[PDB]
Amino acid sequence: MDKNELVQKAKLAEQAERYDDMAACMKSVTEQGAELSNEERNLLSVAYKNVVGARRSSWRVVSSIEQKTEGAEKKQQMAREYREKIETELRDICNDVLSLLEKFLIPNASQAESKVFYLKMKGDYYRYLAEVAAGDDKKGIVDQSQQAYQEAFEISKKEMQPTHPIRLGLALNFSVFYYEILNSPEKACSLAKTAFDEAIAELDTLSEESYKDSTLIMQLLRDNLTLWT
Amino acid sequence: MDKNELVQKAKLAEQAERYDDMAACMKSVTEQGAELSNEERNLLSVAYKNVVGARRSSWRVVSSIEQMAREYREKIETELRDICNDVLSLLEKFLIPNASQAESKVFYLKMKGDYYRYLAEVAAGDDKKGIVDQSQQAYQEAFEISKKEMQPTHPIRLGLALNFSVFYYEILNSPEKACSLAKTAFDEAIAELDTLSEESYKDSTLIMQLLRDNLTLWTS
Amino acid sequence: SASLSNL
Amino acid sequence: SASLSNLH
């Protein structure tokens, strides 16, 4: 198939809720080397968000079961080994996406909006690696994630209005990074509060195509604020 | 690995919502040739209900949209067919011949009817006929055994009437038989509520409500 | 149109 | 904690 066919198959897969197919389709599209359209970018992002999301969810369930079975070693052993099998799937998927990010998506990003999107995505998939990293390894991974978010943050702060959904969304995920990964509720709250308030101050800048997304993300930022305090 | 380990892994797979793992685990248990317990039997059934369920759901979305669609719908259908065949194979080679008890024979014959029904949902050629007939044969025999051997409030018997009545409505296009079967199953259960057990009454009453929901829809 | 799948 | 994934 060629670009157009793959992209249509990916849209088909999405509707069938067959996210591996969808991901595989968009991966191939990305590998033909051309800068993705906005439509393609979202299809890629959606595909892998679901593929990785299934593992993260399975990991937490199985990991929880593992910690709850201190004192039942046969069960705790079966849990651990299964957590590890799931973890390998999780890692391979993140490595898969980070690989597409270095080789294709980040170097080919022409406009600021795209560079923020991809750098945020990179922060995201290093964050997911950080969710399960033990080591002797954790630090370097955590660091890669913070650098990608930070670089993205600086570009969105320079280039985007505060109601832009890509910027609010970066603030959201970067703030989650601070709370969950760096364990700093104050830095998380600060980033989240700042982004919400700056958006509140400029609601007239909302567009027809963006305001739903923008205001939904704002609600998320405020929910995290409420939770975290 | 052994039975108990595999079963325990299947329970982990379920909690993780990883149904391919769950189906594979229970398939392996099934392949050891020993009759499954009630627990294991349910684990097997739940595992494949989900695996086949995803395909049935994707088929309907894609069939409806239908180009690219036709080629993809066929891909899903082949998966769907391979899954049904896997389960129907386990039923012939292991589950049905080893069903020593009447309850298991009904359960498995129902499952056989179910999985031919899922095949029938997607059969279009003159191949449909034999498949449809296969589903009815399995349903009919299970029906006869449950009437002979089970109370009308038994959840497995009520569940069979339910799916069998769905067979008449959806596959054979026969709302009158569907209603007739559903109503009889419901009324006969209503006539003997004292036969409800402690361990079963929740399932039994929920299935009755489903039967009645189907009755209501089909006569509307 | 519900089968046993609903439980 | 809610991330952008939680958007619908």
Residue numbers in the entry:
A (entry chain B): 1 to 229
B (entry chain A): 1 to 66, 77 to 230
C (entry chain C): 18 to 24
D (entry chain D): 18 to 25
Authors' text:
Chibby (Cby) is a small (14.5 kDa), highly conserved protein that functions as a Wnt/β-catenin signaling antagonist. Secondly, Cby facilitates β-catenin export from the nucleus in conjunction with the proteins 14-3-3 and the nuclear export receptor chromosomal region maintenance 1 (CRM1). 14-3-3 recognizes the motif 16RKSA(pS)LS22 located in the disordered N-terminus of Cby, when the serine 20 residue is phosphorylated by the kinase Akt. Structurally, the ~30 kDa 14-3-3 proteins assemble into homo- or heterodimers, with each monomer composed of nine anti-parallel alpha-helices (αA-αI).
Purified 14-3-3ζ protein was co-crystallized with the phosphorylated Cby 18-mer (12KTPPRKSA(pS)LSNLHSLDR29) and diffraction data were collected to a resolution of 2.41 Å. The 14-3-3ζ protein, which crystallized as the typical cup-shaped dimer, has the Cby peptide bound in an extended conformation to each 14-3-3 monomer. Thus, of the 18 residues in the Cby peptide, eight residues, 18SA(pS)LSNLH25, were resolved in the peptide bound to the 14-3-3 B-chain and seven residues, 18SA(pS)LSNL24, for that bound to the 14-3-3 A-chain (not shown). The Cby peptide occupies the conserved binding groove of 14-3-3 with the same orientation as other phosphopeptides previously characterized. The hydrogen bonding potential of the phosphate group on pS20 is fully realized, with two hydrogen bonds made to each of R56 and R127, and another hydrogen bond to the side-chain hydroxyl of Y128; 3 water molecules and the side chain of Cby-S22 mediate four additional hydrogen bonds to the phosphate oxygens. Thus, each of the phosphate oxygens has 3 hydrogen bonding partners positioned in an ideal tetrahedral arrangement, explaining why mutation of S20 to D or E fails to promote high affinity binding of Cby to 14-3-3ζ. The peptide is further coordinated by hydrogen bonds between the side-chain of 14-3-3ζ-N224 with the backbone nitrogen and carbonyl of Cby-A19, the carboxamide of 14-3-3ζ-N173 to the backbone nitrogen of Cby-L21, and the side-chain of either E180 (chain-C) or W228 (chain-D) of 14-3-3ζ to the hydroxyl group on the side-chain of Cby-S18. A comparison between the 14-3-3ζ/Cby structure with other 14-3-3ζ/phosphopeptide complexes with different +2 residues [including the canonical proline (Raf1), aspartate (PKCε), glycine (Histone H3), threonine (β2 integrin) and leucine (α4 integrin)], reveals that the S22 side chain is oriented uniquely, projecting between 14-3-3ζ residues R56 and K49. With Cby’s S22 side-chain juxtaposed between 14-3-3ζ residues K49 and R56, the K49 side-chain is sterically hindered from contacting pS20. Of the three, only the L24 side-chain is buried within the interface, projecting toward a hydrophobic patch consisting of 14-3-3ζ residues L216 and I217.
